[PDB]
Design a protein around this ligand. Structure first.
Ligand SMILES: [Mg+2]
Ligand SMILES: [Zn+2]
Ligand SMILES: [Zn+2]
Ligand SMILES: [Zn+2]
Lengths: 180, 43, 264, 114, 65, 160, 196, 133, 86, 773
RNA sequence: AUCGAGAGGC
């Protein structure tokens, strides 16, 4: 995203533009595009060298002026404490990989285990494509009854993982039974 | 298949270590295990 | 009524029965429920020979599904096990043969239901092998979906079976067991952050029994003979018949032990 | 591949004696009975009824491995009481209780209207 | 690829319920939980077998051969 | 250091001792200065300790350093194993590295040296040297396929 | 393996009657050990079980998306509305005994993925097998039906054990045993020997 | 044969401890200055009070398998509420002519003071502890 | 060096059999039992060659010579009956 | 190198391993298909023709079968193809390749071969399923886990080879490690957890469960234990059934913390004759380490008894644990709200202190540590503040967490769990470290492009206030990812370095064995050690013991060890010795006592010289204390009766015992001197352990009990001496190697890089350092 | 065969 002075510095995008994006999205009239957002100048493409000169905020909500009881369970977030922000990151989760986007809660878990799961998910069985029965691949493994995961990342809809799941939502008990 | 289609390979002064420059462009945690860890990354 | 264990049924249904067992050792109750899961004999398809497979689902997949489909087994005790029978592969006394051939002329995908599926072998005057459909539409469980221009032809040989041998032959899906709902026996110790009463909800079975007064000491001698159980039926065998057959099959195992002792 | 078929666990084979009786060593009235193709279900009930009997000093049920459905019961009785006699009385008592429960449930179900 | 016949934990048949459940949620705009309650799949394992399942059979049907 | 010394009574008491730690080591100059006990001073590098104090002091320092490596993890290895390694380097008058040069130069054997590294160069120099192998070594006997005179093979068995 | 770090091979398959059962009667399709979890420090597996239970009863998909503010207390409160325990510990009874387990046991819906590795493809055993000609050694791989490599590290372990005969058999009789004839006067195997 | 020792003890304090089922018992001999006692008791099996006088007895009897009690053959070894069987972990002397006796029954521990009962206490491991209300 | 006999009186070696020595003696005797060579000791209830070799060793019936070797090459010969087993 | 050192081997198999509790530790579960594949040649013998003919008739597919029959002529007979297989007769001298059968020796090995313990011989058991089966304890020497680890089995092909694996490579023999003087294998995971939960005094066992557990022990006395509680209800302690598991005649006393004999905390253990008097079983009693119950049982009863004990404890504890159950759960990670607020204020106060130190740095009014750059000192202080904050938050969480929650239950049992684990999940992950530094500014003056320039605050530098439960900020997650990435790179690097090291050590030390003279020599014969371990003794059987003369007051040592027959106070009390009335005066016996006291004084001075620390406990050949305890129970010693033993006889017997133990045989003056040197410390320990006053006072000792103690000490020392022909060098190389693999890496070269520099004589030092005294 | 790539278990 791009953040420039409105007045009070504001993210360049606006709710009405998001509403036009949603209007183009439900249609599957005026057509509103990501390329159209770039031509509008609401969003810019940043290289690492360009990244050094910018100041960016993770949350659009952080930018709006802040001047309250807080639930203990929510993670402690350091106040941004910065008056100038050239841009705002679209979402933190976008830093992640596709395999990381598959991982349920990398935020609540230790990163090496997330790395191991990112490696393991490629090994995990699933339906790779619908053309498989037509296709003649040297080795193919396809689950009998693939089940979409109960807890899904938002990014998964762009991953099509819910559409083509690679796991079963097994009922799991954590217990010691006969030492196996 | 999607992850394989987006791969980076660096043929080989601390390449393996995750870089602040890597933020927002490369996955923080996806790398081949053991040998060549961080040499190959996913975007 | 009869001396010994006495059962008062709270609720009745064709699918499920809710009862209270009194003057019962818990060992026998758990043994009974495990018998109902496992020992009760029921007939589901053991052999599937498919003539044509145009549909995308593979034959192994379809055959597993067909084995899962419920088949009526009230007279299954009249039926003799195929291993116990004399015929080399199948006879009418031991096996019931169900044939199904479906082709979809409709451009819309044609369903393949359990109600479609028909019996070749003679009934011999017993209520065996009829697929059970509880659906309001009467449509059977859908084995497959057929694109236009696809035909599937199969023969099924359904034999008497044991749930310990395969899960399809089990008559009952869920048995609900409750004992010591007030935790007077204190067989379990609760995990509570502040208070156990808040952490764990009270049971309905808990409110049936009287509440423990806080002043009375725990009695070591008491062993709970009162249990709250519910049984849910697939419908291959009616609920009351499933529980009676559990009792009878446990009796049969005990009697087998006794006769083996006499032979020894 | 390697695994044994489920029916073999279900039913006896190779002329297996359903019950094998071996005198326990170092105990006068104790005996080990091997039940083959039998499960925890029957064993716990036999043991519970043996424990109910005053004469039997010891009764315990053990399975050597979950893979194989072999169940071993050891019975230690009062002197002058056959361990087999105790086992038979316990089994018969089990049967009487089961029959009484089935009659009570049948009467109750006939009373039940649905 | 197809609706499972039974919940794997219970063994209760769930194949008959799937088509009617899809209808129910369509006609009443029902939240999935209420439709499952109408189905009678109170146990969350039968509920998982219905909700988590996706019919990939339609995609195979779309293929002409 | 907070070290511990016998008390006048005899019980082990602890007295703090001031100690200096130096980034560099010039031990020959360092020992010959006022205000230091020459005996107590130690250098973390065993090589300076060996040059200053002889080979046995260097061996003791080497064992101490290996002991520090094992102790930092909290792991313990019995003194004889670490000792045997240190003694192996120490028995030759000059300290001998575990790496190929130190281990290979020892004129003992031919196929152990070739088995570690530079197999073919060692065989070439051995052919030029006309080295005759005793074949007593474990490795050489493994190449030979004969049973090594090791463990069970060490003692011959004869009729009574 | 779970969608989190921890992976496992199945050591045994248990029938439903044997498995511990709740009052609802739900039997876990899978049982995992409690001990691995603390060392792995994967809280999210636990959180996923809780959220999936809440979602299964609610009929609404649970969002696990990272960096989204969630209350484990909130999810536990929804579970409380359902009546299931906020921690998700479920009172279970052991199958064989029918006795209530003294400790309530965590019971959840967890996504699990079948790994590509399966035993039957891995298991290879050879008593006698094909031999590569030049080495006279065994061939390599299960498809070759070849014998497994004896490690030099393994050889050192055996020398430490001190058993010379086992090493001699594995080193010659099990692999590339050979008979040669050599002349003493040559010092080299120049001799060519016709036994007939 | 006969009870080794008999005493009446008044318990000054009962400590719940880390264990809920088992609480510790600190008591002094009633009317006697020399005996002190520390006991490990199960409050669920026996109600205990912060102040209470409980009759305390130790008996050698009343390689044998424990026989389940049949009311006919069983002569009550005691009307005492609590009976435990223990093996002494240590016999020591706090001061000369002041013997201290330590008895552990199923990992539940016992401490006694005094000399006048040292002849009553024996090296023999077997002991039966008897608490009367 | 050659015929480097070590005197029977003037022997310095552990009286106790080395565990490797006992293992090798048992293996050789068990080969002889597998070879069906006659076994001096009476055999009750065991077919296995190793059990027979162990029973012969406990009886000390096995006649064999274990020759302890030295770096110099001088050889000490100890009869299996002589070496202590513990 | 590739072929001769390492060969593809016939009769080799490999499978995924899953562990089995009901399978004994010694045996390996072997798949029926693998057992069918693998053949052992057996020559036909009059006792074996009957069973072998039946096996040949059974055929290749049947498990008790044969694949091939070898004629005396030797032409191969393939059973499956030949028409003869039905009608064969086995003439004498004809080999038959038996199918691998139960209770046959094989070699089970994990491919990382850091240790001879990692490849050990196991008895064949035949299992129906395909996965190799193993016990849970035997996992630890193998360093294998059930998550897809694959293990290799090799079959002996001759009777001598089977004999070697059974007599030396067996699991019970390798239970006690030569190195680290500790048993390799201990009770692990649920069993261990369960055992503590069984041993709590609150835990009590009901008679049905008591009988079933008694039955569960494979060998049971048949005598029901007398109930711990009788009158209210028949109750049995979990320690009581556990005692039924413990072998009779075993005594263990240990106090982890100072234990009153009353033991209200139940810390420590006392066990007598296999019956546990007091304590809750923890890891160290049941762990691999020395002083564990495994070590004591292995030495006293032999190895097989120890392995069976392993099995029995596993069975009983697993049955109990299944009845109680276990579950980690979310709530264990969850902590109370008030404690959480105290955690947050801890983080806040640490943040304020960091800001104050930063402000002082900005003011340039600063104190510089000598030789540290001012930024270096500031960085060190801030890092230390963050570390203390994390640890303090973890400690508050630990106090908050109940005894009941299962994570703490695992920690108390010693199951998987760490204080850092609890701290990071509960309160605060901590500050991420890359290259021994706080998170660097990859962007100029910015750690992250969101973070402002020139910010040295912990949030910029990557300290994670949030816990794993709390959820992490995206910046926190990225910093944690960098730290974990460096960790994984370091792990793989460590593996490669350690493998090369271990190979170098093994190749260097492979030649050296203990020869018959006890000199450790290579093949050429250069003596690395004149006596192995500088004591001429085996690494095994040595356990650390306290030497009494070292330490303590000199006057106190006099009071304990000095009896002077002439002075009335000095003289042994007549109640202690019958000879006491005659021992007053008796000046010749008194000069012998003076001689023993002078020798003890010389020994004390010598020990004071060996260790300036003079720490009491060092590895020692024979544990005298165990022998004394076994004597007291064996001889039923009563403290009242005066000792039968003559004082002169005690002193002379101790000297005779010193004369009895010879590391090296024969009488040569150099050999005699080396022998006195070898047994100098052992004799010092023995003189301290058997003082005439101590023999008479500390324990009453009948004369026969003292003679038995002497004979047992002699036998134990002789057993402890190193066996000639043992390959010391390979074992030593592996001994450094396996910890080195396990090794994980104010500033000095440390860990694996330090070990690198030590192992190769290095001209350079990354951190030279001279200590100035 | 040869070479390469990928994966597993640390
Ligand atoms: Mg693993
Ligand atoms: Zn028939
Ligand atoms: Zn269900
Ligand atoms: Zn020639």
């Amino acid at each position: 995203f791009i953040v420039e002075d409105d007045g009070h510095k504001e993210l360049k995008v606006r709710k009405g533009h998001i509403a036009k994006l949603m209007a183009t999205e439900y249609q599957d009239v005026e057509e509103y595009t990501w390329s159209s957002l770039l031509n509008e100048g609401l969003v810019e493409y940043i290289d690492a060298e360009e990244e050094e000169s910018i100041l960016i905020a993770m949350q659009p909500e952080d930018l709006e002026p802040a001047e309250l009881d807080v639930d203990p369970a929510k993670r402690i977030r350091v106040s941004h404490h910065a008056t100038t922000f050239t841009h705002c990151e679209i979402h933190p989760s976008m830093i992640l990989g596709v395999a990381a986007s598959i991982i349920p809660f990398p935020d609540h878990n230790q990163s090496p285990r997330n790395t191991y799961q990112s490696a393991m998910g490629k090994q995990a069985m699933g339906v790779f494509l619908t053309n498989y029965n037509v296709r003649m691949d040297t080795m193919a493994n396809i689950l009998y009854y693939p089940q979409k995961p109960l807890g899904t990342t938002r990014a998964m809809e762009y991953l099509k993982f819910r559409e083509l799941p690679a796991g079963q939502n097994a009922i799991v008990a954590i217990a010691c039974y006969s030492g196996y | 298949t999607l992850s394989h289609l987006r791969r980076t390979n660096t043929p080989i002064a601390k390449p393996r270590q995750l870089h602040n420059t890597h933020w927002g462009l490369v996955c923080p945690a996806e790398t081949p295990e053991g040998q060549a860890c961080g040499l190959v990354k996913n975007l | 009524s009869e001396e010994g264990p006495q059962v008062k049924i709270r609720e009745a249904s064709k699918d499920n029965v809710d009862f209270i067992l009194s003057n019962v050792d818990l060992a026998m109750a758990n043994s009974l429920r495990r018998v109902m899961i496992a020992e009760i004999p029921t007939l589901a398809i053991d052999s599937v020979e498919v003539e044509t497979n145009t549909t995308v689902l593979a034959d192994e997949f379809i055959a597993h599904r067909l084995g899962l489909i419920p088949l009526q087994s009230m007279d299954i005790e009249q039926l003799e096990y195929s291993r116990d029978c004399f015929c080399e592969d199948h006879c009418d006394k031991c096996s019931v043969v169900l044939t199904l051939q479906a082709f979809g002329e409709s451009e819309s995908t044609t369903n393949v239901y359990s109600k479609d599926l028909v019996i070749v072998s003679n009934l011999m005057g017993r209520n065996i092998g009829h697929p059970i459909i509880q659906d309001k539409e009467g449509n059977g469980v859908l084995i497959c979906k057929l694109r236009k221009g696809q035909e599937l032809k199969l023969t099924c040989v359904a034999k008497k079976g044991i749930a310990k041998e395969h899960a399809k032959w089990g008559p009952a899906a869920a048995i609900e067991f409750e004992y010591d709902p007030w935790n007077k026996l204190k067989h379990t110790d609760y995990w509570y952050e502040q208070d156990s009463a808040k952490e764990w909800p009270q049971s309905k079975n808990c409110e049936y029994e009287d509440p423990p007064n806080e002043g009375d000491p725990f009695d070591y001698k008491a062993q709970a003979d009162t249990f709250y159980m519910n049984v849910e039926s697939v419908g291959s065998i009616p609920v009351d018949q499933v529980v009676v057959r559990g009792i009878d099959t446990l009796q049969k195992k005990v009697a087998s032990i006794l006769l083996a002792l006499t032979q020894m | 591949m390697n695994a044994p078929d489920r029916f073999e666990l279900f039913l006896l084979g190779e002329g297996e004696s359903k019950l094998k009786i071996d005198p326990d060593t170092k105990a006068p009235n104790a005996v080990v009975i091997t039940f083959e193709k039998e499960d925890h279900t029957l064993g716990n009930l036999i043991r519970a009824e043996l424990l109910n009997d005053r004469k039997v000093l010891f009764a315990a049920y053990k399975v050597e491995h979950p893979f194989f459905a072999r169940f071993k019961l050891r019975i230690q009785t009062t002197e002058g009481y056959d361990p087999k006699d105790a086992l038979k009385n316990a089994c018969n008592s089990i049967i009487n209780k089961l029959g009484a429960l089935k009659t009570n449930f049948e009467t109750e179900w006939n009373l039940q209207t649905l | 690829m197809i609706v499972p016949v039974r919940c794997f934990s219970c063994g209760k048949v769930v194949g008959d319920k799937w088509e009617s459940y899809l209808n129910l949620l369509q006609e009443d705009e029902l939240d999935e939980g209420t439709a499952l309650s109408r189905l009678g799949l109170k146990r969350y394992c039968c509920r998982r077998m219905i909700l988590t399942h996706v019919d990939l059979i339609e995609k195979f049907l779309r293929y002409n051969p | 250091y907070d070290r511990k010394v016998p008390s006048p009574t005899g019980e082990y008491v602890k007295e703090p001792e001031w100690v200096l730690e130096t980034d560099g080591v010039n031990l020959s100059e360092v020992m010959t200065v006022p205000g230091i006990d020459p005996t107590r001073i130690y250098t973390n590098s065993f090589i300076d300790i060996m040059e200053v104090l002889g080979i046995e002091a260097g061996r003791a320092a080497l064992y101490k350093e290996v002991y520090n490596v094992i102790a930092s993890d909290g792991s313990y290895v019995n003194y004889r194993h670490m000792a045997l390694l240190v003694d192996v380097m120490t028995t030759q008058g000059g300290l001998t590295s575990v790496t190929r040069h130190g281990f290979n130069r020892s004129n003992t054997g031919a196929l152990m040296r070739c088995s570690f590294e530079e197999t073919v160069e060692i065989l070439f120099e051995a052919g030029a040297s006309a080295e005759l192998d005793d074949c007593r070594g474990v490795s050489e006997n493994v190449i030979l396929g004969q049973m090594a005179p090791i463990g069970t093979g060490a003692f011959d068995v004869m009729i009574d | 393996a779970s969608r989190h770090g921890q992976k496992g091979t199945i050591g045994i398959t248990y029938r439903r009657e044997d498995m511990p059962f709740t009052a609802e009667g739900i039997v876990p399709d899978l049982i995992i050990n409690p001990h691995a979890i603390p060392s792995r420090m994967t809280v999210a597996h636990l959180i996923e079980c809780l959220l999936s239970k809440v979602a299964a009863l609610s009929g609404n998909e649970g969002d696990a998306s990272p960096f989204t503010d969630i209350t484990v207390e909130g999810i536990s409160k929804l579970l409380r509305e359902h009546g299931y325990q906020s921690r998700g510990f479920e009172v279970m009874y052991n199958g064989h005994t029918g006795k209530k387990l003294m400790a309530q046991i965590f019971f959840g819906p967890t996504y699990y993925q079948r790994l590509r590795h399966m035993v039957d493809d891995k298991i290879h055993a050879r008593a006698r097998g094909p031999m590569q000609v030049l080495t006279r050694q065994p061939v390599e791989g299960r498809s070759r039906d070849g014998g497994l490599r004896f490690g030099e590290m393994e050889r050192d372990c055996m020398i430490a054990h001190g058993a010379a005969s086992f090493l001699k058999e594995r080193l010659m009789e099990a692999s590339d045993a050979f008979r040669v004839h050599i002349c003493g006067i040559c010092g080299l195997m120049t001799v060519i020997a016709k036994l007939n | 044969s006969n009870t080794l020792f008999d005493d009446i003890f008044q318990v000054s304090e009962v400590d719940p401890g880390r264990y809920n089922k088992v609480c510790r018992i600190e008591a002094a001999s009633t009317t006697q200055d020399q005996c002190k006692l520390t006991l490990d008791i199960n409050v669920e099996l026996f109600p205990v009070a912060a102040q209470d006088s409980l009759t305390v007895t130790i008996a050698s009897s009343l390689t044998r398998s424990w026989r389940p009690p049949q009311a006919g053959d069983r002569s009550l070894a005691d009307d005492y509420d609590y009976v435990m069987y223990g093996t002494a972990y240590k016999f020591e002397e706090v001061s000369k002519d002041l013997i201290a006796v330590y008895y552990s029954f199923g990992g539940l521990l016992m401490r006694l003071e005094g000399n006048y009962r040292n002849l009553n206490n024996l090296k023999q491991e077997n002991a039966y502890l008897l608490i009367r209300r | 060096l050659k015929e480097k006999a070590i005197p029977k009186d003037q022997r310095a070696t552990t009286p106790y059999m080395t565990k490797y020595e006992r293992a090798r003696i048992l293996g050789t005797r068990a080969l002889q039992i597998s070879m069906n060579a006659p076994v001096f000791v009476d055999l009750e209830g065991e077919t296995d060659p190793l059990r027979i070799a162990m029973k012969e060793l406990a009886e000390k019936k096995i006649p064999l010579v274990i020759r302890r070797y030295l770096p110099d090459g001088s050889f000490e010969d100890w009869s299996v009956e002589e070496l202590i087993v513990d | 190198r590739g072929n001769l050192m390492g060969k593809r081997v016939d009769f080799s198999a490999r499978t995924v391993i899953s562990g089995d509790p009901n399978l004994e530790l010694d045996q390996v579960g072997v798949p029926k298909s693998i057992a069918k594949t693998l053949t052992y040649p057996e020559v036909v013998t009059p006792y074996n023709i009957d069973r072998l003919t039946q096996l040949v008739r059974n055929g290749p597919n049947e498990h008790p079968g044969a694949k091939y029959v070898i004629r005396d002529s030797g032409d191969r007979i393939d059973l499956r193809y030949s028409k003869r297989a039905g009608d064969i007769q086995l003439q004498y001298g004809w080999k038959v390749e038996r199918h691998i059968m139960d209770n046959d020796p094989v070699l089970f090995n994990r491919q990382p071969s850091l240790h001879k313990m990692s490849m050990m011989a196991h008895r064949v058991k035949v299992i129906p399923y395909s996965t190799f089966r193993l016990n849970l304890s035997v996992t630890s020497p193998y360093n294998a886990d059930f998550d897809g680890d694959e293990m290799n089995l090799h079959v002996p092909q001759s009777e001598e080879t089977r004999a070697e694996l059974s007599q030396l490579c067996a699991v019970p023999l390798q239970i006690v490690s030569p190195q680290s003087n500790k048993p390799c294998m201990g009770i692990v995971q649920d069993t261990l957890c369960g055992i503590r939960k069984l041993t709590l005094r609150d835990t009590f066992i009901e008679l049905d469960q008591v009988l079933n557990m008694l039955y569960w022990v494979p060998d049971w006395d048949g005598v029901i234990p007398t109930p711990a509680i009788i009158k209210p209800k028949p109750l049995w302690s979990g320690k009581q059934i556990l005692s039924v598991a413990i072998p009779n005649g075993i005594h263990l006393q240990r106090f982890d913390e100072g234990t009153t004999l009353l033991s209200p905390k139940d810390n420590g253990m006392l066990i007598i004759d296999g019956q546990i008097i007091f304590g809750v079983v923890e890891k160290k009693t049941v762990g691999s380490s020395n002083g564990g119950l495994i070590h004591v049982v292995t030495r006293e009863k032999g190895p097989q008894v120890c392995a069976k004990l392993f099995g029995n404890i596993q069975k009983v504890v697993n049955f109990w644990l299944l009845h109680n159950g276990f579950s980690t759960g979310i709530g264990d990670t969850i902590a109370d709200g008030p404690t959480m607020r105290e955690i947050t204020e801890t983080i806040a106060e640490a943040k304020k202190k960091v800001l104050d130190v930063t402000k002082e740095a900005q003011a340039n009014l600063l104190t510089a540590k000598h030789g540290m750059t001012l930024r270096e000192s500031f960085e060190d202080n801030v890092v230390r503040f963050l570390n203390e904050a994390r640890d303090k938050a973890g400690r508050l969480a630990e106090v908050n967490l109940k005894d009941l929650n299962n994570v703490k239950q695992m920690v108390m049992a010693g199951s998987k769990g760490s204080f850092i684990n609890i701290a990071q999940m509960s309160a605060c992950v901590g500050q991420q470290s890359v290259e021994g530094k706080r998170i660097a500014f990859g962007f100029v003056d910015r750690t992250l492009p969101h973070f402002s320039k020139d910010d040295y605050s912990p949030e910029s530098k990557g300290f994670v206030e949030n816990s794993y439960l709390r959820g992490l900020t995206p910046q926190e997650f990225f910093f944690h990812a960098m730290g974990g990435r460096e960790g994984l790179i370091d792990t793989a690097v460590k593996t490669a370095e350690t493998g090369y090291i271990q190979r170098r050590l093994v190749k260097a030390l492979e030649d050296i064995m203990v020869h018959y003279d006890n000199t450790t020599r290579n093949s050429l014969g250069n003596v690395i050690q004149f006596i192995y371990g500088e004591d001429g003794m085996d690494a095994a059987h040595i356990e650390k013991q306290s030497l009494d003369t070292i330490g303590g007051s000199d006057a106190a040592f006099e009071k304990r060890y000095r009896v002077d027959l002439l002075n009335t106070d000095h003289t042994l009390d007549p109640s202690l010795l019958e000879s006491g009335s005659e021992i007053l005066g008796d000046l010749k016996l008194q000069v012998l006592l003076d001689e023993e006291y002078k020798q003890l004084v010389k020994d004390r001075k010598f020990l004071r010289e060996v260790f300036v620390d003079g720490e009491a406990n060092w590895p020692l050949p024979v544990n005298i204390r165990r022998i004394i305890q076994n004597a007291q129970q064996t001889f039923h010693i009563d403290h009242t009766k005066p000792s039968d033993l003559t004082i002169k006889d005690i002193v002379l017997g101790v000297k005779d015992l010193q004369e009895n133990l010879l590391v090296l045989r024969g009488k040569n003056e150099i050999i005699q001197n080396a022998q006195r040197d070898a047994v100098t410390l052992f004799c010092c320990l023995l003189r301290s352990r058997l003082a005439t006053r101590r023999v008479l006072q500390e324990y009453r000792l009948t004369k026969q009990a003292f003679d038995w103690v002497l004979s047992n000490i002699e036998a134990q020392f002789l057993r402890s001496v190193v066996h000639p022909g043992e390959m010391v060098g390979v074992l030593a190389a592996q001994s450094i190697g396996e910890p080195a693999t396990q090794m994980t890496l104010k500033k000095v070269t440390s860990g694996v890089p330090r070990l690198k520099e030590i192992l190769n004589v290095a001209k350079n030092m990354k951190t030279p350092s001279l200590t100035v005294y």
